[PDB]
Design a protein around this ligand. Sequence first.
Ligand code: MN
Ligand code: MN
Lengths: 290, 580, 69, 117, 322, 274
Amino acid sequence: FTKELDQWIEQLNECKQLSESQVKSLCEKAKEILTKESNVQEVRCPVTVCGDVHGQFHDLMELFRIGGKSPDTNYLFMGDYVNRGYYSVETVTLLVALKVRYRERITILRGNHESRQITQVYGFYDECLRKYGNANVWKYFTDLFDYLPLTALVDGQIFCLHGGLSPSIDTLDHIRALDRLQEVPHEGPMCDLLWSDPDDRGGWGISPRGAGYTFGQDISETFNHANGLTLVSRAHQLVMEGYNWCHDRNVVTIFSAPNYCYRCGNQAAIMELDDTLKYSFLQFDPAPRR
Amino acid sequence: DSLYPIAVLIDELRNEDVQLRLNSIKKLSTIALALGVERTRSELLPFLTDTIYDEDEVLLALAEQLGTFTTLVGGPEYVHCLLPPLESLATVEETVVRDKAVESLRAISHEHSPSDLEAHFVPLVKRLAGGDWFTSRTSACGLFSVCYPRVSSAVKAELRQYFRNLCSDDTPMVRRAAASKLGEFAKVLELDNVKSEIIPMFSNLASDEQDSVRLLAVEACVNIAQLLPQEDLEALVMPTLRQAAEDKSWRVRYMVADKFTELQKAVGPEITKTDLVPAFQNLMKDCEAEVRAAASHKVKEFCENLSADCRENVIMSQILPCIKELVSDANQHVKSALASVIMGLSPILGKDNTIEHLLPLFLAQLKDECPEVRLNIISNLDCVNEVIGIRQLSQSLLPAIVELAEDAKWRVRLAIIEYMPLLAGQLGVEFFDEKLNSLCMAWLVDHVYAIREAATSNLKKLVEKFGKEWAHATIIPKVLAMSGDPNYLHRMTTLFCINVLSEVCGQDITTKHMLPTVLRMAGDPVANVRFNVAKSLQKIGPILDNSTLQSEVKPILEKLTQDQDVDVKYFAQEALTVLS
Amino acid sequence: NKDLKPQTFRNAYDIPRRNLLDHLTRMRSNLLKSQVHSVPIAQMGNYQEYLKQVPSPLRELGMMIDEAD
Amino acid sequence: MPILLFLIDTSASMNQRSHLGTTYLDTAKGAVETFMKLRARDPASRGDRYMLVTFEEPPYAIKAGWKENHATFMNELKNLQAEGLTTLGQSLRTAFDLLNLNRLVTGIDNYGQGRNP
Amino acid sequence: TCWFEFLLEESLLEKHLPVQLIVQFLEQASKPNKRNRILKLLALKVAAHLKWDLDILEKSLSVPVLNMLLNELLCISKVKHVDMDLATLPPTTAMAVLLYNRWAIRTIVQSSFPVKQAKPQMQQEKELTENILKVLKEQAADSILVLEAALKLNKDLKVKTEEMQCQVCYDLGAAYFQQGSTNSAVYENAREKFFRTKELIAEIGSLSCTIDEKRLAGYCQACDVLVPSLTPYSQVHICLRSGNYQEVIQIFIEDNLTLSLPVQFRQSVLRELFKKAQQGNEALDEICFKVCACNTVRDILEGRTISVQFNQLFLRPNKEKI
Amino acid sequence: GGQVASLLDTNRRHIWSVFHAGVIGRGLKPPKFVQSRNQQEVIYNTQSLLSLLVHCCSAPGGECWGAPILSPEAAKAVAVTLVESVCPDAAGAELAWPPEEHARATVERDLRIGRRFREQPLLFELLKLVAAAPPALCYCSVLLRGLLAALLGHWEASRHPDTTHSPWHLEASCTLVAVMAEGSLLPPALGNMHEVFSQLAPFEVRLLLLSVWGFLREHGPLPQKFIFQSERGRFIRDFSREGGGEGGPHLAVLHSVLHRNIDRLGLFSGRFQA
Ligand SMILES: [Mn+2]
Ligand SMILES: [Mn+2]
């Protein structure tokens, strides 16, 4: 009862979307898999951490050619598998299918674009509407996004989350105690958790975006010391160099989308934690297109 | 009102949200099926003819639905009644709506019978051509092609005259539409009529002050470069060809250079040589990067199709100085465009000509800053190696190749990787062993996975090519050293290497070397390693000896089946089933 | 030493014993023929300056901010 | 052409938290940000120039004076540390002296010649 | 197909592999009339296709949709139901009124139940549900009296009177049970009604109307416990109600031997006995000590901490205590 | 039962390139903490400590018959020092419970209290020791409030259909409700709801605990409400005089929860009679 899933994975690698019934079955399986995952998903140390993809499917295949094919390479995607791209549906379907097939070998965390409103505005809803002639697939996927874990925790040291920290969150136990199965609110713990950014700042600050906060170096230092974390991996912001250390090597922003709307020209990078957390960033350029 | 289904139902659906209107558009077939065909046409089509204020989305679907009326309208005697509502929608200001409209119109015109097609569509063609809205004429542009191969001679000539009158329209959108649709129109028209009607005023169109109209005129020109007889082709095309090629607008010159190869192949070798050798060199010598890049792309196709008697002379005389000046161009994109097919000329030029003129250019390309240039130039070393010989290339390009193998861009590295079987076939074992073997091993530890798998496949090629004991003396110790690596990805490279080698490494060597190495790796803490070991044993299973197969593989696979991780369980079970 | 920018390659006293061998290998390999990625947050995703520095390509033929307009 | 001087308290008492979870200094920075946002609604706001003074020693109290662009003001405002005394009097004197720095040289105060609104 | 597609073609009813069609027709009719009548007739026909499986319609279709459907059925078929009565009427009108009253009391009972929190047009639907529930609560007594009177009569696309009577008395028992939380006489009436339901089910012995057997067994157990008019748990509850506490001790010793009763129940009865002892009779000191000793011994056998009550009860120990 | 060569080997491992750019933090995490002790020894150590505490708390003397009474002063002392030890007694320390909006506004302290209760099983035993004396459990209002808020958050966040997939949280909810009943902070009807927690879905038990919170908002654990019954030298909470002591809306919620799952909860219907 798994050969069909491997066939779907093979089909998706050629960028061929599944039918509505297939997506429904996939979402059902994924929901039955994601419910058994805590908000802070523990992850074994050998894993390739990857930032945003934003539906740039050919760039996702570029990323796979860089870091290797799953399940031979463990992966960890920190949200934003949709919007700002012409192949959001294929990207999210491939990631969810990999999650269903190889749940131990891949972890997918909720992003700030994993929301009904953001998908309605920024064109994942429109892409689903065009590619399927109705909103049923969009409904199925946005229902699944409620179940994606908020954060991860690699070997109890590296803390991977899409966004930044929150003024009301200063313990991993608080994140574990959240009720993630809901829409991203306009404020509160998980909204800040998915929307916040670091900054060359002292203390907290209202984010330039419509939600979240901006936290300075001292904030990340106190959080890291209190929670016994060495690093706070993050993926919410664009990085021209592909990756960028912040706050005296306490926070690293990883962007895994070469270009961002096929116009920014930014490089991409993915962190590669080995068997002893000896990290390494593998940068790459956008793959050639027709 | 409410009793009558069609009008009330469709009006209320229109009053609903737009997606429900799209659903209604697909529902149009069902209401047609339920109601009588005469009822369908006589009632619904006048309603479809007007009162449309939904330009955004539903109009393309509506045009597509109208194009689907195979039997719902009833037949050609009613398809011509189906024609006016498409005409009403053909006047829509949105461009894509008009495109789908003319598509449906062409489909139904094909569905029409001949006499019906003329007697019904020809008045519509005149009306759209004579319409006050320029949009009607732009729509009418498409339909001039479909009527011609079935209608009579007098109506054919009238249609040609109406198209020719349309080209004189003052608004430039109409002329653009006419130019774009001119290719198929002239394609289906009769050659003498093509000449007499089109070609004077087609040349007039090519001289129009609107640059976009001139781009589409160039498109038409390259389209119609094969239907005329040779002498008339010369007298009617060459003045226009040189006029377009030396046009002020850089876009026109770019378009001329873009479509050069089929223009060249269609109008004979000697004519192209004589009256395009200055223009082509001019195109590569222009002051904008776009046309230069296009011409550089088209250089190889331009050269290869010339007459062989004087091809080398014209190449070496005109093109080579231009290419030499082009390789040093400041713009990197034109260099990348040139680098794609610059070394395709080498079989054509010859051995000595390539060694003298082209080799320093190749060396310059390999040492260029732009990685796109380096990608393009490396991509076709097969032909130059075939025509120049391994000795000259090894003396000349081998250090440059080795320097390229250390490049930052992994795509460049894998481009270099793919030729190691090729170099290996044409070169002895000793020199490769003492020059490139350690370099081949260097790729195995590379960060990028594509590099590692490419090197793995190349290792397979080398072991099947350079023998078995040589691999044991050179390759196998490095693989064993890699088996002890702390990082798991290097161990996975080792397992992939075992997979590729074991097929062509011989039974005894495979067991007595790989099996102690593969079996020890089964106790690794990382689950990735364990399931890759299971997969490797499954793959290299049938190729080794049977007693060793049972006694070694079966216990450890039994161990892996009860291992806690799910993937290890699945792959171990699969391996056991495969072995049986 | 706040904002010291320890020149680890240039000075051998800035190498912690914790990671002496790894930095030794890196500086050795760098020295032969064969601090970055710590840009400030403001200059981290300013694509305008990066594109202006880079060569130009071929000429052209609810919450509020979500980057890249 | 008005002047907006923000005399942000940087005494260590501004590290007190509130139900927001942020310190008082954070809420002060946010108050300045929101004041700028509300001010920008008016068309006349393009002509103002902002000034920043803190409760530090005199050589470091002023960190956005005259001839300082808006970006420098924002950068200074973000990196404020509440670590001093509540030396309100001395800092207020510094702020008033900064504002009255250029009055005499341009002679805007017509001393002994009546007051000109 | 869809709402408009099915209006003209009359073949999808028997072919499709239904509730979706019902809600689509209701939504189409809800938009502010031959088409409305045709849609209502189609909705009633498809509803009858399921043989009026009121559970399926209740759970799938919303509250206002089913309310409008039942009101439309009442309007087309017939027309103070309590004053109406007249069971000797056509079977269509009789079953329509019976179904409406059954739906009324079942919706009352279901709205009494709790539902999972609404984490995220829905506001208008919620307002309509609230208004319908309020007006239904207003005339609940009339509806329940009509249903009871109809159930009393036995003078019956008509169906077997036994199944209709069993279903309506089950719904009556559920309505009384919800009503009986604040009145024990209503609980007695509910017990009588559920015993009548069980007797009817036993008599007919059917296996084809749909009654939740587990729910019926639970209702029977609850009614037996509340108003008995066997198992050691029920024996302890009865003895606590009466006051035969020595029997409670003996059952507790048997429970220590068998490990049957919940630990929570034993702690709770110990707590209430301690409350009574601290309030009233002084002879309850010894009985409280005895049951506390039983609980302590069970906790020891199961491997759990010794209670504080045992510890204070073994200060100043006596010969009889040990 | 509470909870809780470098350089040379590196050269051995080290082909001539670093490959990895560095080590994230201080290398690998340790082999993690482990614990093991006989549960019988834990039980009897707790028994010894609790027996000593009961001895120290119970008043001297006397008469020839009658079990002793735990002193409310000693139990109050144990309560206040428990509050000081577990939580900082920082904010919202007044005995009157606040709205649930405050429960959502102080989730960090509630989680700290919950983690302290989870790591140290001895805390519940001391809680019921305090609850043995009626007035003293009122002073643990902050502890009970925080633990209840933590459990409410857990049950809201829970996604399992059965409540037994969360063993400690189910046991903690049952123990918490039982302890509140022992100290006469709840009526007997509310006090019996822990008997049925093991059968319900998470949202139902969350609703019951929220009903407990609402009841404690209405009445409250105020020691002045405890009337000193001089007939036996003991404080007794009178709910009949309190007005709505049976908890009308709360019993309505409990009856609705029981009625929804009547198939499994029919036998338990008698535990909540008036
Ligand atoms: Mn993001
Ligand atoms: Mn993003």
